[PDB]
Amino acid sequence: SGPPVSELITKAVAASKERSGVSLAALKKALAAAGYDVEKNNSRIKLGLKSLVSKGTLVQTKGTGASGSFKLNKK
Template sequence: KKALKAGGYDVEKNKTRLLIAIKRLVASKTLVRNKGSFKLNK
């Protein structure tokens, strides 16, 4: 979220889209949970 906000993306307006995208990436194992944050899978 911080990186998107720094790039000029309206995070508050598109919060639900972000949540859905994050859930989809975790389900497809592209993102991995890491103690309260996420990292890209190798």
């Protein structure tokens, strides 16, 4: 089975936690370093990030849609 991508993205945004949000390229490279097939899952990571920001668990800093930088919620 294996944990879905959303928990991996939460660990990715919690890995560094610099002042600005974590970027799309940084989270892709974080998935590559932790171990993930980022090549065939671009639509997957796009829909996953949109789904998680729609819940409000993570908020958008600067960009629009899948672009920009991504940082976690208030609490």
